[PDB]
Amino acid sequence: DRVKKLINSQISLLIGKGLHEFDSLRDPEVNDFRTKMRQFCEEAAAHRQQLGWVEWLQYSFPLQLEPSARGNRALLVNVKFEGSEESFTFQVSTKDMPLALMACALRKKATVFRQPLVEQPEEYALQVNGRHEYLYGNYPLCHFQYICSCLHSGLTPHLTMVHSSSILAMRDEQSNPASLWSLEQPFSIELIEGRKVNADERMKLVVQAGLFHGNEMLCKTVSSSEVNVCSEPVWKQRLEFDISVCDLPRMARLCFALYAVVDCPIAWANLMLFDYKDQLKTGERCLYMWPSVLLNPAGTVRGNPNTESAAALVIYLPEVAPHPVYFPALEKILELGRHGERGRITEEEQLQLREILERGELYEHEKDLVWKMRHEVQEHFPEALARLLLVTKWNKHEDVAQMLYLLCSWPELPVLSALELLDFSFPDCYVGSFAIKSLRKLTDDELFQYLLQLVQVLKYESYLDCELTKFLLGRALANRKIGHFLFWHLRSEMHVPSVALRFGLIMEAYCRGSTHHMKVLMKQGEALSKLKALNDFVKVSSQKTTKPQTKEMMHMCMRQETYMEALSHLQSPLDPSTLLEEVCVEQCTFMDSKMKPLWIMYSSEEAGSAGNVGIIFKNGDDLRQDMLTLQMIQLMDVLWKQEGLDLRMTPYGCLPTGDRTGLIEVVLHSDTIANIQLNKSNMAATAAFNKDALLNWLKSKNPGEALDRAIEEFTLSCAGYCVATYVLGIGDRHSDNIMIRESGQLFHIDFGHFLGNRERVPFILTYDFVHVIQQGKTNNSEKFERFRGYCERAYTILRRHGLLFLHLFALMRAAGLPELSCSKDIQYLKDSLALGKTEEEALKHFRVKFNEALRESWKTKVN
Ligand SMILES: COc1ncc(C2=CCOCC2)cc1NS(=O)(=O)c1ccccc1
């Protein structure tokens, strides 16, 4: 049928790779994933097309709640009905529920239309005007992110009563069309030859090989003999590893490194000793090696796709038996692990276990005590599983059976513990499956908060079909917002040839699950395609002609029918809730920096003031570190909000969408501190002293009694960013990367440097901001000390959740960020959060650091 061919060409267009390239690989593991995941994703599609209307609202328009609500006061609301142009303004309470507001809107409509109404508030849902956002459920109004937002900014909520029949019509329009353990032989392989090798002919070539189970070496690394450097080196030898074949763990990977000697790395390549169907690998293997920067165990176990250039390493995995040798089944493993011995011991050794499991590296004798007491670890300290898995001898199949027997009876762990187990230092498939089992209780909101880390964890995976891929795909097919961001996180990495196969295969599986959503994502990629061409034209044009003429050239290019069709009426890749309707070509522009980023403005007749939104298209710079930094700041704001602390933060969206390409959400009514401190003449803010400019600017935007609230929004946000930048190690802070909103809210932009990357970043305190906190006064210790308390109270909330940040940053090592790769980078966080110390000692240390920042600020007050 021409529908399947059309869908296939559309999927190929969307994921940035033709589906024909997957079939051309003639790979059983690739094709068996494509069938298995297509079946799974079409099941989800059918389940979804039969959902109730409230469950389809939960799929498409998941609730956006205030972090305090998860797990009185007068309010003016405007409610219109779908199709109608007349609306009703009424004053309800922040503690009233949506159903009461719907009953009140149906009463006003029944009185206005002089008819006794049959419809009931149970048949309706409230849409945020011109938005893919809905208010529903038994939650008071103030609990919704939209109503709470309106309260802070003084604006009036505009809602539309959508009927159950119109909601079902959306659902209907959006339809998809119709034995190893008895082999004590030492492990060995044949190093046959090497092809396309480029190196200095003065030197010699060596091949180093190690056996890994995640990070720990299964045995000592072995090396080949030094051979003369050439394009075709030949060893023809047998390297022998000090490990039995029966003792090979299921997740064992043979890691190779090709290099030149007289240190000079040329290439690296890894492979799994067992295939995806559990069969031990035998035969001739060609390893298309990856360039080097010596063994790389964390690197992928798949060949370099560029075979017309990559250096090859031809090896032979010897046939250990006259029959196919598979990895033993769980029943065979549990039966062997069921016959161990429980460690009965005195309170003296029990005192050490109760201390070293709560208290971090271990001593050799301490590991002997953790393994001996493994049964007591399971029963009394179930959250110490990660310590026990690290003391388990993975190079001993009998010790792996003893561990797996305890794991299979181990109780489900809390999300914080499960997040730790996803780390690469726990590569066992059963340990990953148990960790996924304990993540299933994650709400859509927690899942969305750690989605970026879970996507990086896919890079650590050894096989295509994994529990994490199925978990992520299942949650994405059940929630259109998870699906949206899962698509973009994978799509942004298609240019990386090591993840392109897996990421493109998951994106195809998702696309089968939702034909409609793929067409919405295509519309987004179409706009990004024109933004790329539009940015290029601006880069070339701006270097020859002036800024006003290049901006008019940009507006002419934008006014072409192709650009008007592509750039308008789309969901925002930065927020599916936000509809980018009419491009306001007049207000679009670009910045004066080397990459000339585009500022695209949008408006909406339906959404009103909410519809006037902006996006920034950036091409040339990498946005991955900004996205992570902003996500961590967002996390801080959630944690602070859950303890009743609202520091008025501004975690705007940042979305990488391709190769050095991405979008940033524009924060309207905001300016940089540098622009405000330029002190232009004939402005409502022209100062006598430059220190007054920032405060005068606030006075113009916030007249009379509004200034009091504006100074308080500034102060709260200052305390939030001071702590955030100190904890995260953000440096390169200057007037042009600190912005302020007309409301008084301060915030940071340009997050290219973090984790002190490498000098320890001190606590920063600017006298220009201290002058605002002090309300213009020289001495105002009441206001300044209120601010020190906001810092202290925000810092101690973050320390309480310090393990969550550490576990998230550890998973993020997989992203390959230059300022995030080794223990040294994440050491910065342990220092900033002072996690080794007590709450009194860390607070004393934070006070000394804040005081040392105040003395530096007084070098400006002395002037
Ligand atoms: C890292 O680059 C950025 N990061 C954030 C923003 C934002 C701005 C205003 O709205 C919230 C986001 C903008 C940029 N990039 S830019 O070149 O457009 C820019 C730089 C400095 C001042 C204003 C604009």
Question: What key phrases describe this protein's structure?
Answer:
863 residues; alpha+beta; Immunoglobulin-like; Serine Threonine Protein Phosphatase 5, Tetratricopeptide repeat; six-stranded antiparallel sheet; 32 helices; 27 strands; 44% helix; globular; binds the ligand COc1ncc(C2=CCOCC2)cc1NS(=O)(=O)c1ccccc1; EC 2.7.1.137; innate immunity; cytoplasm
Protein topology:
Blueprint: H1 2-15, H2 20-23, H3 28-49, H4 53-60, E1 74-81, E2 87-93, H5 98-112, E3 124-128, E4 134-135, H6 145-153, E5 158-163, H7 164-173, E6 186-195, E7 204-213, E8 216-217, E9 222-223, E10 227-228, E11 234-244, E12 253-261, E13 265-272, E14 283-288, E15 290-291, E16 312-317, H8 330-337, H9 347-356, H10 364-372, H11 374-380, H12 385-391, H13 397-407, H14 415-421, H15 429-439, H16 444-449, H17 451-460, H18 467-477, H19 480-491, H20 500-513, H21 515-542, H22 547-558, H23 561-567, E17 570-572, E18 575-580, E19 582-583, E20 589-590, E21 598-603, E22 613-619, H24 624-642, E23 654-658, E24 661-665, E25 670-672, H25 673-676, H26 693-701, H27 706-728, E26 738-741, E27 746-748, H28 767-773, H29 781-800, H30 802-811, H31 823-833, H32 839-861
Parallel strand pairs: 1-5
Antiparallel strand pairs: 1-2, 3-4, 3-5, 6-11, 6-16, 7-8, 7-9, 7-10, 7-12, 12-13, 13-15, 14-16, 17-18, 19-21, 20-21, 21-22, 22-24, 23-24, 25-26, 26-27
Helix pairs in contact: 1-21, 3-18, 3-20, 4-7, 8-13, 14-15, 18-19, 18-20, 19-20, 21-22, 24-27, 27-29, 29-32, 30-31
The chain binds ligand 7XW.
